[PDB]
Symmetry: none
């Protein structure tokens, strides 16, 4: 998993999956994630797209140009059973397999759930350093950084400090994240553009006193 | 296999279960057989099985905090025994916490 | 995730990944699954094989008939660190992904410690039914049917009773629909089917049962 987003449920929701040119694309496959993966569609760069029968009347794709790299999944009339986790799996040569995970949640604008704890104004071209606000004697089990927009959360990184594997987002842009050594608290956004404006959230999952967070608004001139 | 957490019996006892991408959570009672208590999925939500419907509840707080603690609002002598808090993550798989409920307090 | 095949150590060990013919083969990739997914080699049916630098000296593959459905990972040389778990992933169109997990065991431990609890004799051409010996004292979490050979142990059937499909090319008839997990049928048995078979029962919160049976075909 190199890319993890969350989007609100809608009857006409589209699950964005645009792959960066990286080597040769050899196959794409869409899955509904559960304990067992449910295949939605499979794409050949030679023979085209096959939608699995349970989804034949429920999803479609755009007739976008080849160099658009667009595998975005579109729902006709989505229903409550289409809530959950999705996988857009990219198979490339010689780099290998990578996966984008998209979670469909029941939700309003993701900005509405978060009031900013902080505001920073920067200019394009500068690196922007963001920090968590570690507090307690309570051990931090997990740390996660997200970029928040009204229609989309981009999971930038998470560090499991007690158990599990870590995650660092590649795509769409570079996130400087390390996790090791009590510097899970800091990330850098190198060379910001206006499109980097938005809300940035650090969530701290602790042991007994779990669940604390810090939001900061970035505004690029 | 033995237990991870051991608690004494109480009518209002709560069985703590704390803890990526969670695809399924299920509570079982382990005796001579395995009885399902409640099952959760991100698509269907939390669905409690009928034999425990009047016994247990969940305070569905932040699920991203990884908390599925089983609350007894009423508990009887037969709620003593072994419990399993079973967890499936994507694509890693299993994570299981076994909990013992002791009658002697 | 558990394994499909298990083999003992050897510096010339061959981790068999014979796959079925199913649609168009579009890509193959070998990983070593440790605490992290580590890439060994990647194959394109047009561009050929790339072996990642950490395994360039270690491993090699046949350049012969690959159309025989063969991507077996041959070791040229091997150390303690080549012990562990491997993933042989086949990518096909339109069927999708086909994955075989392969276990390499260290201590010089293998079928030498496997005595039978039961012995069945059958003539070739017969449909042989094998059965577990469930004791009905722990709920059965999961069922594994395995074939124990001198050079490899293969998974025949897996059933989680809360998914994992066999990659063994024998066509074992099994269902695990409603208690069916306790039996498997070997149809039209041959002399090559002789050997040790094991039913493995995983308990939810207890100890695991083992029933080993020897089948000898006339």
């Amino acid at each position: 998993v190199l890319w993890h987003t969350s989007v609100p449920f809608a009857e006409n929701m589209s699950l964005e999956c645009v792959y960066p040119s990286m080597g040769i694309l050899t196959q794409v496959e869409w899955f509904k994630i559960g304990t067992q993966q449910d295949s939605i569609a499979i794409f050949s760069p030679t023979h085209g797209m096959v939608i699995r029968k349970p989804y034949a009347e429920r999803v479609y794709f755009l007739n976008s140009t080849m160099a658009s790299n667009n595998m975005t999944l579109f729902f006709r009339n989505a229903s409550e059973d289409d809530v959950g986790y999705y996988s857009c799996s990219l198979y490339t040569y010689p780099q290998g397999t990578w996966q984008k995970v998209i979670q469909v949640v029941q939700s309003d604008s993701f900005e509405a759930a978060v009031p900013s704890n902080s505001h920073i104004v920067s200019e394009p071209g500068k690196n922007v350093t963001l920090t968590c606000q570690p507090q307690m004697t309570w051990p931090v089990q997990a740390v996660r950084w997200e970029k928040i927009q009204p229609r989309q959360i981009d999971l930038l990184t998470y560090c499991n400090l007690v158990h599990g594997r870590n995650f660092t987002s590649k795509f769409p842009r570079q996130i400087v994240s390390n996790c090791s050594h009590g510097r899970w608290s800091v990330i850098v956004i190198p060379d910001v553009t206006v499109s980097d404006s938005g809300l940035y959230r650090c969530y701290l999952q602790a042991s007994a006193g779990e669940n604390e967070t810090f939001v900061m608004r970035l505004t690029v001139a």
